Structure 1
Amino acid sequence: MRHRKSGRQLNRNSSHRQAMFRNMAGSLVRHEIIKTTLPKAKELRRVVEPLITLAKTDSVANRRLAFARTRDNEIVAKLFNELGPRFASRAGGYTRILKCGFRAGDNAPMAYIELVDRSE
């Protein structure tokens, strides 16, 4: 009954949740700005931010481990080279959420999530 339990369900099973976060995590780092619902964004930080922390140290083992997530070499290629140095001097809080109202199709809590600086 959710006593000291973490991990939202999002009306999906374990396989769909893992794949959807994996696809969304790669999309976010590729563009540095995506728009998704508030519960999706809030659980996305528990995925991309640990991934960035792993990407802080560059090694053959870390890159392979980072490749096991997001299942994409180009996403791993951008990591350890671009987002590494930018977040090397930062301890957590790589992402922030910007609420932007509700959709007109289903009236869902809408929010942007992006990196800290985005170099823009």
Structure 2
Amino acid sequence: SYINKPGKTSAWRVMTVRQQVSAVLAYGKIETTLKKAKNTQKRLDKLITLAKVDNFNNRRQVKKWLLNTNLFDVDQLMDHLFSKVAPKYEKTPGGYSRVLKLGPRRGDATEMAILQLTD
């Protein structure tokens, strides 16, 4: 079609997924869209499992998915992760986090759900 919005795009979706996984690592609970939250949880679990090795290769892997926040920063993200987040789930082989289905969105009635984690 003629010039119009690109909107949701593969690069846009992967950047947004990176934003959400970084956010959920920073805080621990994120209210988002469940449809993309499925793959968000998938990638979060994969990276957490990858973060458990705790070596320089792991630091390089984390280098590809960090973005700063209002107060918590990328260096703080990596430090806190390799300090207590990744070692926390060493006793859990998969099934790290859980999504709880919240109500539909006020603006568009999209299925908003909250992703959280515990161990």
TM over 0.5: yes
Query: Which TM bucket (shorter chain)?
Result: 0.7 to 0.9
Counterpart residue number, 1:13: 9
Give 4+ residue runs of structure 1 displaced > 4 Å after superposition: none
Rounded Cα–Cα distance in structure 1 between residues aligned with 2:79 and 2:43 = 18
- Of the structure 1 ranges 35-44 and 65-74, higher mean CA displacement relative to structure 2 is found in 65-74
User: How many angstroms does 1:92 deviate by?
Assistant: 0.7
TM, length-normalised to structure 1: 0.81
TM-score by length of 2: 0.82
Counterpart mapping for 1:92-103 below 5 A: 92-103=94-105
- How far apart are the structure 2 equivalents of 1:116 and 1:84? 12
- Which of the numbers 79, 82, 107 marks the counterpart of 1:80? 82
Number of aligned residue pairs: 107
Supply the distance in 2 between the matched residues of 1:75 and 1:26 (Cα, whole angstroms).
Answer: 8
Query: Quick check: 2:22–2:65 contact (8 Å CA) kept in 1?
Result: no
The CA RMSD measured in Å over matched residues stands at 1.4
Q: Which runs of 5+ in 1 are unaligned?
A: 1-10
> Which ranges of structure 2 fall in alignment gaps of 5 or more residues?
1-6, 68-73
